[PDB]
């Protein structure tokens, strides 16, 4: 541990349980640096109540310890890359940050920004605004005194609203700005709803070449080494000085010396550690960087696959220019063949050598999920079959002939997460509000699956016609909120599948949800619905009698639409 860039926030953490801490010798911790501990000190039940087939479906209940999480998935190392595949990471990362600055000048965001975007409250006081400036005038001296993550075990790491300002502060122009767009960087797909991207996966089908590649890697966070922290850091040289020292002070304490703060006769301690490599999951732009050096990979994996990269290469890179001009000729052409969302990709390579290009993958701990390590990758043929960000995309027709292409998961992934409530002491209205909010998502996005647009419809018969949706369905950049209103969801539909839609040419209005199909048979059943399974046809048959129940609990004074009939 570097003791100079984080012992400040070490000494204000004793600070404030002094009395208490401690240094614990037994502690179990082996490639995290361990400096000291102290003393430490749901269920939406109106989907519940409309789902009863799904109350006895390990796929939904199961989706409603942390030292558990940490000893097997974050407490790990990587050896270094060699120094060849450094120089290769330096090189490729330099000229994608030149690529995706040509048309774009990084800028600082600012509170009235911030502002804005929480009002989606210790924003509205002026104290937290003090605290926020006290620890500006820390790191524009060199020192940090509080960007320390609370880690709350896949592992999550919160910090307090103001960390996450003066993060948003320096480096939140990424996301504003939209520097991993599609159109400014190719093979992003930043700001694009899951109602377009299988419209993107339909149009790589179409780039000639090999197999569509959609690998996984095992624990992203968790293999970005230091080398690729530096190279997402070299965006501070197309700063200004003074946007320049905010932003190094955000990678030095929030990126790169990172503090965190972890819980472990039923008492409980929380333990002081350290780690200088590893994406802190949950910061501001963590999905931004995640998608550069995603990007960064991919444009190495078909280097080595186009031979450009030799096996001589991994230990030291002796001529770039071969790298450069591949860059310069081939390298936008191999970021439109790609569709990048963080860390989950779809690369459609010139050929099928990609997937047999391991070695730079290998050498920059970027391994894949559930295959053997040089077993080669297996391709897609079927775009409709290939996963990217957690679904499939399928083509269906409307009653009229026109193609649409929709999104697609397991339906108990959907059901599991609507059950789910966040917030204690909750009552039925923000309740049954977070309900409506799934019903209409469901609307709009998975209308095409049997189970979803019956449960759907009898969620937003049970809940007052005047209630504005809350809460989030998904923390997902890719759902973009056009259901969270109470605006009719046959006029939403139309905007967003047919006018707003660049992907369908005739832009005739759809007039009638029996227009809007489903999956066939087969698919909705494949896909996990519960069409023909007793419980489901009786739920389905009972349908207006628990709506009813619902509404008798909401209140029979309220004003109801039947969407059933
Ligand atoms: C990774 O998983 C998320 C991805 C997905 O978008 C790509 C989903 C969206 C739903 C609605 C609009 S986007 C949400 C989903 C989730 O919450 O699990
Ligand atoms: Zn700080
Ligand atoms: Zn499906």
Same mark, same amino acid.
């Given at each position: ?315 030291? $890179?002796?001529? /770039? ?5 591949? @860059? ?6 191999? +970021?439109?063949? &790609? =569709? ?93 509000? $977070?309900?409506? /909010? ?5 609307? @709009? ?6 189970? +979803?647009?019956? &449960? =759907? ?109």
């Amino acid at each position: 541990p570097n003791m100079k860039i984080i012992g400040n926030r070490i000494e204000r953490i004793r600070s404030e349980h002094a009395e208490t801490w401690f240094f614990d010798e037994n502690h179990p911790y082996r490639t995290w640096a361990y400096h000291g501990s102290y003393e430490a000190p749901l269920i939406n039940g109106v989907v519940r109540l409309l789902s009863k087939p799904w109350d006895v479906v390990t796929g939904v209940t199961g989706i409603a310890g942390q030292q558990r999480v940490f000893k097997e998935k974050v407490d790990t190392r990587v050896p270094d890359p060699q120094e060849g595949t450094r120089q290769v990471m330096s090189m490729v990362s330099s000229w994608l940050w030149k690529e995706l600055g040509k048309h774009k000048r990084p800028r600082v965001c600012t509170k009235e920004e911030f502002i804005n975007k929480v009002r989606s409250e210790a924003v509205n006081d002026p104290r937290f605004w003090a605290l926020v400036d006290k620890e500006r005038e820390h790191h524009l001296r060199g020192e940090c005194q509080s960007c320390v993550y609370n880690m709350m075990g896949r592992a999550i790491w919160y910090m307090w609203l103001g960390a996450r300002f003066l993060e948003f502060e320096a480096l939140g122009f990424l996301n504003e700005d939209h520097w991993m767009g599609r159109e400014n960087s190719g093979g992003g797909v930043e700001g694009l709803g899951l109602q377009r991207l299988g419209y993107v996966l339909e149009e790589m089908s179409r780039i000639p070449g090999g197999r569509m590649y959609a690998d996984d890697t095992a624990g992203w966070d968790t293999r970005i080494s230091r080398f690729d922290l530096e190279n997402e850091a070299l965006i501070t040289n197309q700063m200004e000085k003074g946007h320049r020292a905010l932003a190094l002070a955000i990678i030095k304490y929030t990126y790169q010396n990172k503090v965190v703060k972890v819980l472990r006769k039923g008492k409980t301690v929380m333990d002081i550690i350290s780690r200088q490599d590893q994406r802190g999951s949950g910061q501001v732009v963590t999905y931004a960087l995640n998608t550069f050096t995603n990007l960064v990979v991919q444009l190495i994996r078909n280097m080595e696959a186009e031979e450009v990269l030799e096996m001589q290469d991994l230990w030291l $890179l002796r001529r /770039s220019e071969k790298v450069t001009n591949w @860059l310069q000729s081939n390298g936008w052409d191999r +970021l439109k063949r &790609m =569709a990048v969302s963080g860390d989950d990709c779809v690369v459609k390579p010139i050929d099928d050598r990609f997937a047999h290009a391991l070695r730079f993958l290998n050498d920059m701990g970027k391994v894949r999920k559930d295959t053997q390590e040089w077993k080669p990758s297996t391709g897609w043929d079927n775009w409709e079959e290939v996963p990217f960000c957690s679904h499939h995309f399928n083509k269906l027709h409307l009653k009229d002939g026109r193609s649409i292409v929709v999104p697609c998961r397991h339906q108990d992934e959907l059901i599991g997460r609507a059950r789910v409530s966040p917030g204690a002491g909750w009552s039925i209205r923000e309740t049954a509000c $977070l309900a409506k /909010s799934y019903a209409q998502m469901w609307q @709009l996005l998975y209308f095409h699956r049997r189970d +979803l647009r019956l &449960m =759907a419809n009898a969620i937003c018969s049970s809940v007052p016609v005047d209630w504005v949706p809350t809460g989030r369905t998904t923390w997902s950049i890719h759902g973009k909120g056009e259901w969270m209103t109470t605006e009719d969801m046959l006029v939403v539909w139309n905007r967003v599948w047919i006018e707003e839609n660049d992907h369908m040419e005739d832009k005739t209005p759809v007039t009638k949800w029996t227009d809007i199909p489903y999956l066939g048979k087969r698919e909705d059943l494949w896909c996990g619905s519960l069409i023909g399974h007793r419980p489901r046809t009786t739920w389905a048959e009972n349908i207006k009698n628990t709506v009813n129940m619902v509404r008798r609990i909401i209140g029979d004074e309220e004003k109801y639409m039947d969407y059933l009939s």
